Amino acid sequence: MQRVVVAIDAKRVDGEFMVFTHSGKKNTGILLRDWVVEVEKRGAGEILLTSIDRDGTKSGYDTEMIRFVRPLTTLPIIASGGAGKMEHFLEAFLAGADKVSINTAAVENPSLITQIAQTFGSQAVVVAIDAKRVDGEFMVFTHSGKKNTGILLRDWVVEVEKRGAGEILLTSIDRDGTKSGYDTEMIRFVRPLTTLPIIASGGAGKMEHFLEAFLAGADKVSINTAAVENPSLITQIAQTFG
Ligand SMILES: [Cl-]
Ligand SMILES: [Cl-]
């Protein structure tokens, strides 16, 4: 149903789009075509699709990859930006994406939220926010969790709502900027600031881990490596929560 977002990182290797796990380092051997179909059947709510470059890092929209995934699924496809311009975004939507996910691009140019929302719709923008507590405040980090922007999480969540974001993808990050597990206190902190769906980005894969995020206030969880390694997690979450 609605509670599961599957994030899929993929790139063409050996002439096929293949699914990568562990921060885009491990070629799992799984065809993107098979995995997209299987996640839909297991009850995923939407797919966050990220094209990754030669060493695993987040690359820009791959329109061929978006067009390839499109006929396999009736779910919303969220294309994970990496890109900063109005024509960048148009290309993803023409290729088949239903939404784009932006993070550093949005932070550095907030009007991109507004521009995309104005052109493509109120459901078209996902803002991904990486954040951790520093100096006694939850602060927004950009550039793969490395730069403390100086922006309070509380201010940015409000601003992205006002600019017309459709959902927030929230990731708690650890001491060196990598994706950490659910921060329930950060989820509870963001809950009262926004009437949008909050997607908590997981970092870990056991079913009471997920319950805690939903009890903290998250409406959906995003899973990637945990789902690939144990695909029934998708089915379990969908069964319990929607
Ligand atoms: Cl192909
Ligand atoms: Cl606080």
From Swiss-Prot:
Among the GO molecular function terms of this UniProt record, one is: imidazoleglycerol-phosphate synthase activity
Q: Which GO terms describe its biological process?
A: L-histidine biosynthetic process
Enzyme class name: lyase
Q: What does this protein do?
A: IGPS catalyzes the conversion of PRFAR and glutamine to IGP, AICAR and glutamate. The HisF subunit catalyzes the cyclization activity that produces IGP and AICAR from PRFAR using the ammonia provided by the HisH subunit.
For this protein, what reaction is catalysed?
A: 5-[(5-phospho-1-deoxy-D-ribulos-1-ylimino)methylamino]-1-(5-phospho-beta-D-ribosyl)imidazole-4-carboxamide + L-glutamine = D-erythro-1-(imidazol-4-yl)glycerol 3-phosphate + 5-amino-1-(5-phospho-beta-D-ribosyl)imidazole-4-carboxamide + L-glutamate + H(+)
Record protein name field: Imidazole glycerol phosphate synthase subunit HisF
Complex formation: Heterodimer of HisH and HisF.
Give the classification, highest ranks.
Bacteria, Thermotogati, Thermotogota, Thermotogae, Thermotogales
Q: Is Secreted set as a keyword in this record?
A: no
List the subcellular locations.
Answer: Cytoplasm
Q: In which pathway does it act?
A: Amino-acid biosynthesis; L-histidine biosynthesis; L-histidine from 5-phospho-alpha-D-ribose 1-diphosphate: step 5/9
Q: Which residues of the full protein are shown?
A: 99 to 219 of 253
Q: Where is the active site?
A: 9, 130
Q: Which residues form the signal peptide?
A: none
What is the primary gene name for this protein? hisF
Offer a single GO CC term for the protein.
cytoplasm
EC number in record: 4.3.2.10
Instruction: Give the superkingdom in one word.
Output: Bacteria
Q: Does the keyword Lyase apply?
A: yes
